[PDB]
Design a protein around this ligand. Sequence first.
Ligand SMILES: [Mg+2]
Length: 577
Amino acid sequence: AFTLADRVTEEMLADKAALVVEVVEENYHDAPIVGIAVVNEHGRFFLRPETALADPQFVAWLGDETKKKSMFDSKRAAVALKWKGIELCGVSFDLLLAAYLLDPAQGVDDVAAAAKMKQYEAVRPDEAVYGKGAKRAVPDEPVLAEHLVRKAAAIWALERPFLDELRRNEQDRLLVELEQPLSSILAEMEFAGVKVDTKRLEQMGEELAEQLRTVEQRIYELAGQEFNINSPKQLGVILFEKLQLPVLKKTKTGYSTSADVLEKLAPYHEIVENILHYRQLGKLQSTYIEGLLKVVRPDTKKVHTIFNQALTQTGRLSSTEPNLQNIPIRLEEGRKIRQAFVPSESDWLIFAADYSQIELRVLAHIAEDDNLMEAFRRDLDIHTKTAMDIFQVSEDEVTPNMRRQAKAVNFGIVYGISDYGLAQNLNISRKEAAEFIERYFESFPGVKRYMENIVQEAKQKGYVTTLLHRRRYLPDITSRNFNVRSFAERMAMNTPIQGSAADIIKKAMIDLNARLKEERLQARLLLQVHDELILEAPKEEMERLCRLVPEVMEQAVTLRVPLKVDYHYGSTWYDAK
DNA sequence: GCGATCACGT
DNA sequence: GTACGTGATCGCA
Ligand SMILES: [Mg+2]
């Protein structure tokens, strides 16, 4: 049982408690808090939020760093409270982040899923209480209060076992000194938001719509027929079958119309290049322009992303609504969408800094490959140097296609691509792709040793780790299915690289946030995507940031090779280049 | 409301 | 068969 309280009492405000501040809406920005539960040494309490959040003693307790709180996904509560003008401090244990560090593959999305990891089942899944989809609804207070109280009781009971296993894993500091402090920095970033120039966005959409009408009219002209170009089925009817173009690749059900396949079909009919153009502009328009305009808050003309800190299996952050990482880094209209992201105040500017080749630099360090480390200590062009070694040619002898092929081999390492995906990448056979890989290993024998050694370690221990002791379990590394084992092998190889890079960027964000406040700068972190950190700041702060930000980022950790940072600033995210 | 297909990132 | 994740569109029960 528990106290369904009508008012806040002093025994509810002890200096250690499990706390539940429930936000049912998936997007928690400016969203309702439907109820509150507190479990501490004196009992179990349910508080109605309209009551507790107006109580000065309760508000002071929430904001008191010395009053320690154990929670699940504290960033959600922290942000929903920020929109109410209330500060949450003193969160000493976050069970979502603890379960994520223990085993990111579990997919722990609620208290019940984390509780099940330690045989605790006296709590329901959130989906059982609130329902999913069209049926989703807050239940009546008796059902709601029991659920919130059981979640707090579970949290109270699970802190010690989770912390104990974290300590056995040497992940206790990872949680306490990296993920939890980062959680709060993300909260501030999400709350601050990023100003969007919606008039510029609507202009680009208008530009695209006119271009799409032009190309679409041309496609119907060449097809001799109207159809939904956006329907891969109707389009497969028209390309193959009608226009008799070869079928070079099949889909599980019908005709494949992938971009990779269409480019090879272009020499046969003028429609293909226009189909390719329609899909380019179509995805910019439909996914990015219209997608971004939907998530801009009209009150403040900002987008307020949500970072999922406990999702990837590498430790990389991910973000949604909007996912600004997914914005293209390529075309002279994809990356230009970044012109719509502007400073939120007059006479402020965007400052953007990004790690240069951090993954390959991490690989140099972990593998202690002599040639790769010397390349970075010389600050070489890594793709040019790789081409020199693979093709045994001098720097002036490297042609553009040689550099492209070396860069594709390096890209394969950074993202853990199979030789078939390298072959697919380079439009070459798997045999040729394999001999490319072998020549790489001849020039970087330390990388080869690392790749053999890490697979063997994964087989022996069951998992691999990153620089700051993140882990990834790889049960499929034993599989007799070739493709399943091969993927686990590539994840054994890739996760210490990508995940250690994630570690460094997170530590950099923490280090930078501390330095900015030490320095009493108004500059603020706004986004972290790819290997980049984006800030905004008064224009009067740019010269100081030009020294401060790269220094903090370069010194976040000390590797056997230097860390290199490129930095720019400008009037938009695009112009910070 | 799900698979399935595509295109973006990892 | 030969790469998972995000998110949009279009298909089908
Ligand atoms: Mg990246």
